[PDB]
Structures are given as structure tokens and as C-alpha cells.
């Protein structure tokens, strides 16, 4: 021995590697998650209570933890040491939720909002410069505690100015909206039934213009939509299909509390919506009566946490009822990852989850006060 | 769904969907039409809940005939996915039944909800 139909026989002959390299691949593979553990954040300074809430700083490399120890333990996360830059004890102020905040216009402004089962709320600007929000300006009846709250950005269209807003849960379907800095009561939103959760999405209008819409859901699963730029008027109504005993609602794929923006142009709309509940389903909706794209049925207890990746490719759902009740779902395939978590993966009773704005870190707190860290090698 | 009559309204659905979950917890609930059929034969059911959106609706319309004969209150709910969900199953449920137990811990709520149902009837 010594087109063209035989092209396949040649290319097969050349290479014994036929798998396309995932380095060029930009969205993560469907079922295989390349995840490696890093040392826990709190090893430098352990927490004496559970990790009720967790939050990554929008730009700086800082991680904030709080809990019933009444301390705002903030750690400089580097993945190799994780030392404690500072802490802040707040006597008589149990910490149920805490979060970083940066003014969307004034990047220099940095503030911390922390709240609990109390009729007052603490703000910490960036000795400690601290402020107590304790006045509701005649709406004290609607509100019994500041324990559950979130911070969003509101654009004053008639002046084009943008400022932060503090959102609270009322006793009977009420949502109280307060000024982030002045603390003034701006608007209020009410729903039928017991308010269980609410979440925020941003819809850009044009260059420099955006509107904020309040998403509120009842335990029965009926969801309201209020326009906070128009005195909190309802703009839409729809129901979650097969929803009963709802517990949490979250949006993903755009700007949110977990993935805040640094300038107006960075405002993006969320394409995903997940609804948690007591029995454990997570109905996922494509924001682009509706019909859920998928009805996840893995976690067998109440959904205590729902969170989407900064790019909206991974949805993380956790339950505090039992140990290791933590799963990661690939989007939009809606398929749960199988390789991780494993039986030997240490999670305990998951109570808090946080995604870094960039770098692909996973941080998970548990009842034992341990914040365990992981790296997604794909990011 | 014209054959579906009477059909519970949004508010009336809430407490009946509320009771079944408690009954589901306390082993006071049956799931499935044939068990809902069989419990009527025993006469051990407070009332039977059905889904109006089941296709074909004739599958569950036999139970009202049994319920009327046995003087058992019954009600219809718009969505089946919610019922099976509230029942606590991973599958849709078109029919359900509650155990007759005067010693139950949720007896008053079960008594409270039927009182709406014969008024519905």
C-alpha cells in the first residue's frame, strides 16, 4: 500500500479527542458542575450562633454575616485566609437579615442595613457611624417588626434622581416602603391574604431611565405586581399554577439584591422567576395566566431560600428543615446537578446562601455558625 | 366546565385547600377517586373535594351521585394541580376525602368548612 465523502473518516483519524473544550464554552455544562471547596470564612473568628443571613459586597472583596449573636461579622474573603476586617455587636438587636448597599448614583456611598424581630432598624454608614430607623410616621399599626426587609433602587422620574428604598412586610398583606437615608415613609402596598415573600425586578425604559416593580405573593400563590414609580399602583395580576402554601419568591437573570448594579446602564431585566413553598416544589417561570417551564420536585421540605446566579444560569434552593437539603439546578435545562452535593459534602442545616457578584463563589451558612465556601471553576 | 357545579370561589377554595393539608398531615385524608368512591360506600367521609379542570370531567362526576344519595356534602375546585399539591402528593389529584373522626384535632376547622359547603349546595 502507498465535496469529498471521506471527510469524517479523516477528522476521526486525526484526533482521539472529540469533546469540545469547555474553556471556550461560556455557559456551564448541563449536568456536570466543576466545583471545588475552599476553607470556611469564619475560621478566623467563629460565630456563636447560626448564620441567619449572608451578603457579598457589590465591588469590594468583603462578606457580611449576622445572627442571633447580635454581631455584624464582616470578613475579607480571599479564598485562602479569610480574615475578619471588623465586627459590630448590637446589644438587644438580634440579626435576622443584613445586606450590603451601595448608592446606584454615588458609588462612594456604602451602607449596611440590618434588622430583626424588633420595631427598629439599624443603618451603618461607610468608631462606628450607625443609625436607628424606628419611625413609621403613622403606619405603626400595619407593621410589627422590621425583621424581613430588602433594599432596592427607585428612580424619581419627574426629577430623574435615583435613591434607595427599604421595603418591609406588614401584618396583613401590607408592604411599607421607606426612604433608605431619610427613613421617610414614601408609599405602601397591600395584598389580600398573608404576605409571605416579595422580590424586586428592574425594567429599563431608555437611556438612563428604569422602573422598579414590586413582586408580592400570598401563601395561596396569587402574585401581585405594583409599580413603585407610580405610587405603587397594581400593573398586573396572575397566579402560580399548582401553588399552595407558598414560602418564597425570587427573580434571576438580571439586577437584584444578590447582583446589584453599579450604574444606570447596568440595570437589566430578570428573565426567571421561582416560587418556593412548604411541600418543596419550585415552580420556575420564564419572565420573557402563565405556565411554569418546570416544576422541580427534589427537596422534600419547606423551601427556606431561593437564589439565582449573577448571570441567572444556576438556581439554588435550600431548606432549613433537614440537613443537606441543598440542590443546584442548571438553567434553562431545569436539570439538577448530580455530582454535587454528595453524601459527604458538609452542609448541615442550611440557613443562608450567598453568591459572589463575580468570581463564582458559593457561600452557605448552617445552624452551627459555619459558613463553608466553594468555587465554581467554570466562572 | 358547566357540568362542574357548585364550584368553589377563590376565597372558599383557600380554607378547603387549607383543611386538606392539615387532614393530609394528620392521616385524615384520602387521595384518589376510587378511594373517594370507596369511602362513600363505608360512609366514613365528611365531604368529598373534586377538581373541575380534570379531563374528561366525567371521571369524577360519579361521586356527586354517590354523595347526593348518601347526603354527603361535596364541592368542586378549579385547579387539580393545587389539590394534589395541598393533599401532599407529587401527582395531580382530582378527588379527595376526609376521615369521619369526632376525636380529630382539626375537628372544628373541618366542621367549619363543611358549614360553607351545604350553604354552597
Amino acid at each position: 500500500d502507498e465535496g469529498d465523502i471521506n471527510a469524517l473518516t479523516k477528522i476521526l483519524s486525526t484526533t482521539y479527542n472529540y469533546k469540545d473544550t469547555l474553556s471556550n464554552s461560556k455557559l456551564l455544562p448541563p449536568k456536570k458542575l466543576d466545583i471545588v471547596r475552599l476553607k470556611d470564612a469564619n475560621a478566623s473568628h467563629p460565630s456563636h450562633s447560626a448564620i441567619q443571613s449572608l451578603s457579598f459586597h457589590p465591588s469590594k472583596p468583603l462578606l457580611l454575616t449576622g445572627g442571633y449573636d447580635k454581631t455584624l461579622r464582616i470578613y475579607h474573603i480571599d479564598g485562602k485566609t479569610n480574615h475578619l476586617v471588623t465586627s459590630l455587636h448590637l446589644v438587644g438587636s438580634p440579626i435576622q437579615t443584613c445586606t450590603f448597599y451601595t448608592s446606584l448614583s454615588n458609588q462612594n456611598q456604602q451602607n449596611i442595613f440590618t434588622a430583626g424581630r424588633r420595631r427598629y432598624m439599624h443603618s451603618w454608614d461607610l468608631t462606628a457611624k450607625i443609625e436607628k430607623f424606628s419611625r413609621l410616621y403613622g403606619h405603626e399599626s400595619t407593621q410589627r417588626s422590621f425583621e424581613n426587609f430588602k433594599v432596592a433602587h427607585l428612580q424619581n422620574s419627574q426629577t430623574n434622581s435615583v435613591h434607595g428604598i427599604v421595603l418591609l412586610q406588614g401584618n396583613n398583606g401590607w408592604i411599607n416602603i421607606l426612604h433608605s437615608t431619610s427613613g421617610l415613609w414614601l408609599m405602601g402596598c397591600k395584598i389580600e391574604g398573608v404576605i409571605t415573600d416579595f422580590c424586586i425586578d428592574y425594567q429599563p425604559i431608555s437611556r438612563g431611565k428604569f422602573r422598579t416593580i414590586l413582586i408580592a405573593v400570598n401563601a395561596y400563590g396569587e402574585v401581585w405586581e405594583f409599580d413603585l414609580n407610580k405610587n405603587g399602583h397594581v400593573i398586573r395580576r396572575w397566579k402560580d399554577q399548582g401553588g399552595v402554601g407558598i414560602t418564597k419568591i425570587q427573580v434571576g437573570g438580571g439586577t437584584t439584591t444578590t447582583c446589584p448594579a453599579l450604574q444606570i446602564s447596568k440595570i437589566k431585566q430578570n428573565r426567571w422567576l421561582a416560587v418556593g413553598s412548604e411541600s418543596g416544589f419550585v415552580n420556575l417561570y420564564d419572565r420573557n395566566t402563565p405556565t411554569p417551564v418546570a416544576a422541580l420536585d427534589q427537596l422534600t421540605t419547606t423551601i427556606s431560600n431561593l437564589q439565582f446566579s449573577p448571570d441567572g444560569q444556576i438556581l439554588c434552593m435550600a431548606s432549613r428543615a433537614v440537613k443537606d437539603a441543598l440542590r443546584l439546578v442548571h438553567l434553562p435545562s431545569c436539570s439538577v446537578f448530580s455530582n454535587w452535593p454528595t453524601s459527604g459534602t458538609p452542609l448541615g442545616k442550611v440557613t443562608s446562601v450567598a453568591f459572589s457578584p463575580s468570581g463564582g463563589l458559593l457561600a452557605v451558612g448552617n445552624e452551627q455558625g459555619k459558613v463553608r465556601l466553594w468555587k465554581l471553576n467554570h466562572y | 366546565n358547566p357540568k362542574a357545579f357548585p364550584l368553589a370561589d377563590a376565597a372558599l377554595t383557600q380554607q378547603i385547600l387549607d383543611v386538606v393539608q392539615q387532614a393530609a398531615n394528620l392521616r385524615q385524608l384520602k387521595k384518589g377517586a376510587n378511594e373517594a368512591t370507596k369511602t362513600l360506600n363505608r360512609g366514613i367521609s365528611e365531604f368529598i373535594i373534586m377538581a373541575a379542570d380534570c379531563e374528561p370531567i366525567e371521571i369524577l362526576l360519579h361521586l356527586p351521585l354517590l354523595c347526593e344519595d348518601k347526603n354527603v356534602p361535596y364541592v368542586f375546585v378549579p385547579s387539580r394541580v393545587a389539590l394534589g399539591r395541598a393533599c401532599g402528593v407529587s401527582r395531580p389529584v382530582i378527588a379527595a376525602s376526609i376521615t369521619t373522626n369526632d376525636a380529630s384535632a382539626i375537628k372544628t376547622q373541618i366542621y367549619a368548612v363543611k358549614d360553607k359547603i351545604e350553604t354552597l349546595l
Binding site: S279, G280, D297, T300, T301, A321 | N25, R27, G88, V89, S90
Partner: peptide, 12 residues
């Protein structure tokens, strides 16, 4: 069953 008293476990 789980039978912790029955533990709250969704029936897959």
C-alpha cells in the same frame, strides 16, 4: 415511612 410521630417528608 420516616416515623420520627411522622416526619414531614414529601412523598416523591
Amino acid at each position: 415511612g420516616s416515623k420520627k410521630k411522622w416526619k414531614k417528608q414529601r412523598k416523591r
